[PDB]
C-alpha cells in the first residue's frame with residue numbers, strides 16, 4: 255500500500271504534489287513521474303524538483319513550464335527498488351487550482367450614500383475567478399458574505415456613517431475556467447470609517 | 448433596437464417570451480411572424496394598441512415560463528405583415544439576435560424582513576432568468592420619500608447578485624417607497640428591466 | 654473569432670453543467686441547445702482555419718448524444734468532465 259499523492263496548482267504558478275511518507279514503516283524514497291493525455295506526445299517524465307522530508311522524498315514540485323491545465327494529468331508514484339510497487343492517478347488540473355489572495359483592495363465613494371470595493375488578481379485572469387466578499391460593521395457582528403462572479407467589484411448601496419466597516423475578499427477558480435472548490439486565503443482587511 | 452428594420456423594437460426575457468413594439472392608409476389587422484434559423488417552428492401574434500403610435504405583440508415561445516426556448520447563437524427573422532385588400536402584405540422584415548436584446552422580467556416578492564427606527568432590510572425574488580445569464584445578475588433600486596417623485600429619488604446600485612439591501616440613515620417614523628430592477632451585463636447590449644411593484648414601508652417611531 | 658467562441662463556450666458550459674446535474678439526479682431541451690451552440694462553435698473554428706478545434710467541437714456534440722445512453726457510470730463522468738474541460742480551455746485561452 256503506497257500513499258496517495260495529493261496535487262494542488264497554486265495560482266497557476268507552480269504545482270506541489272505530496273505524499274505521506276509516515277505511512278510506511280521504513281522510508282522507501284519513492285519516485286514520481288508524470289505525463290499528459292495528449293496523443294503522439296505521450297511519455298512519462300521524472301520529477302525535476304523533488305520535495306523532501308528528513309532527506310527522503312516528501313513530494314514533487316512542477317513549474318509553470320510543465321503545467322498544462324486542460325490536458326489530463328497522469329501522475330505515477332513508484333518504488334525504485336520494487337518497480338511493480340506503483341500507483342497511478344488521473345487528475346484534472348483546472349479543478350485543483352488554489353488562487354493567491356486578492357490584493358490592492360480599494361474603497362471608493364460612488365455616491366454620498368454608497369461606496370464601491372475593487373480588488374485585483376496577481377497571476378490568474380479576472381474573468382476566470384469567483385470572489386466571496388465579507389463585510390461587517392463596528393458592532394463586530396457576524397460577517398455578511400455574498401459571492402461576486404468574474405468582476406472584481408462589490409457594491410454597498412447604503413452605509414452608516416457612524417459605524418465602521420471592514421472588508422475582505424477571497425477568490426476561487428470556478429466555474430468557467432475551472433471547477434476548483436477550494437477558496438483562496440483571505441485578503442488583507444480594508445476599513446472604512 | 449433591431450438591426451435590419453428601423454422602427455421595430457423587440458425584447459427577449461431570456462426564457463421563452465419575445466415582445467415587439469411597433470412605432471407608427473392604416474389597415475385593420477397586423478401580425479408579427481418570427482422564424483428561427485436553427486428551429487423549424489414559426490410563431491405568430493397580433494399587434495394591439497397600447498398608447499399613441501405604439502402597438503405591442505407577445506411571442507410565447509415555450510410551454511414553461513422557465514423553458515430555454517432560444518440560445519446565444521439563435522437568429523430569428525421577425526416580419527411584420529398587415530392584411531390589406533389583396534391579403535397579407537409584408538410591411539417590415541428584420542433580423543433579431545435574442546441575447547443582444549435582453550429585457551428581463553421585473554423583480555417581484557418585495558418585502559421587509561427587518562425594520563428599525565433607522566435600519567431596514569428589503570428582499571426580492573426574480574423569475575424567468577436564464578442559466579445562461581444568471582451569474583451576471585445586477586440590481587438597481589431607488590428609494591423615495593412618500594409624496595415625493597421617483598425622478599427625485601436616490602438610485603442605489605448593486606453591481607452583484609444580492610437580492611436584498613440593508614438601508615441605513617433612515618429618518619424615524621417616516622414612510623418610504625422602493626422599486627428594484629434587474630439586468631445582466633455580459634456584453635451590455637441589453638436594457639434594464641422595468642421597475643418592480645413599489646413597496647411602501649414606514650420606520651419605527653423615535 | 655476567439656471572442657465569439659469564448660462567449661458561446663461559456664453558454665455551452667452552462668448547458669453541460671445543467672445536464673450533468675440532471676444525469677446525477679428537460680434534458681432534451683438543454684442537450685438540443687448544447688448541440689446548436691457546439692455546431693456554431695465548430696463553424697467558427699472552421700472559418701478560422703482551426704480544423705483540430707472544430708473536430709473537437711464535433712466530437713463533443715456526439716459525446717453529449719452518447720451520454721444519455723451510456724451505461725457505464727465511470728465513462729459517463731469521464732465524458733462529462735472531458736466536455737467541461739475542453740469548454741473551460743476555450744474560455745480561458
Ligand SMILES: *[C@@H]1O[C@H](CO[C@@H]2O[C@@H](C)[C@@H](O)[C@@H](O)[C@@H]2O)[C@@H](O[C@@H]2O[C@H](CO)[C@@H](O[C@@H]3O[C@H](CO[C@H]4O[C@H](CO[C@H]5O[C@H](CO)[C@@H](O)[C@H](O)[C@@H]5O)[C@@H](O)[C@H](O)[C@@H]4O)[C@@H](O)[C@H](O[C@H]4O[C@H](CO)[C@@H](O)[C@H](O)[C@@H]4O)[C@@H]3O)[C@H](O)[C@H]2NC(C)=O)[C@H](O)[C@H]1NC(C)=O
Nearest residue numbers: 458460464466497498503505550551552553642643644645
Ligand atoms: C410576455 O411578455 C409580455 C411583455 O414583455 C415584457 O415587457 C415588460 C413589461 C417586461 O416585463 C419585460 O421583462 C418583458 O419582455 C408580458 O406582458 C406585459 O406584462 C406586464 C406585467 O403584467 C405589463 O405591465 C403592467 O401593465 C399594467 C397594466 O396592464 C394593462 O394595461 C396595459 C396598457 O397600459 C397602458 O395604460 C397604462 C395606464 O393604465 C400606461 O401607464 C401604459 O403606458 C399604457 O399606455 C395593457 O397592455 C395590458 O394588457 C393591461 O390591459 C400596469 O398596471 C403595471 O404597472 C405596475 O407594475 C409595474 C411592474 O410590472 C410597476 O413598475 C408599476 O409601477 C405598476 O406598479 C405594468 O406596467 C405589460 O403591459 C405587458 N405588456 C404586453 C405587451 O402585454 C406578458 O405577460 C408575457 N407573457 C408571458 C406568458 O410570460
Ligand SMILES: *[C@@H]1O[C@H](CO)[C@@H](O[C@@H]2O[C@H](CO)[C@@H](O)[C@H](O)[C@H]2NC(C)=O)[C@H](O)[C@H]1NC(C)=O
Nearest residue numbers: 397398399400560568569570609610611612613
Ligand atoms: C438582509 O436579509 C438577507 C436575506 O435574509 C440576508 O442575507 C443572508 O446573508 C447571510 C450571510 O450574510 C446568508 O448566510 C443567508 O443565506 C442570506 N439569506 C438569504 C435569503 O440570502 C442579509 O444578511 C441581511 N442583511 C444584513 C445586513 O444582515
Ligand SMILES: *[C@@H]1O[C@H](CO)[C@@H](O)[C@H](O)[C@H]1NC(C)=O
Nearest residue numbers: 262264269270272305312313
Ligand atoms: C508547496 O509544497 C509544500 C511542501 O509540501 C506545501 O507545504 C505547500 O502547501 C505547497 N503549496 C504552496 C502554495 O506552498
Ligand SMILES: *[C@@H]1O[C@H](CO)[C@@H](O)[C@H](O)[C@H]1NC(C)=O
Nearest residue numbers: 282283284304308309310311
Ligand atoms: C532519496 O532520493 C533522493 C532523490 O533525489 C536523494 O536525493 C536522497 O539522497 C535519497 N535519500 C536517501 C536516504 O537515499
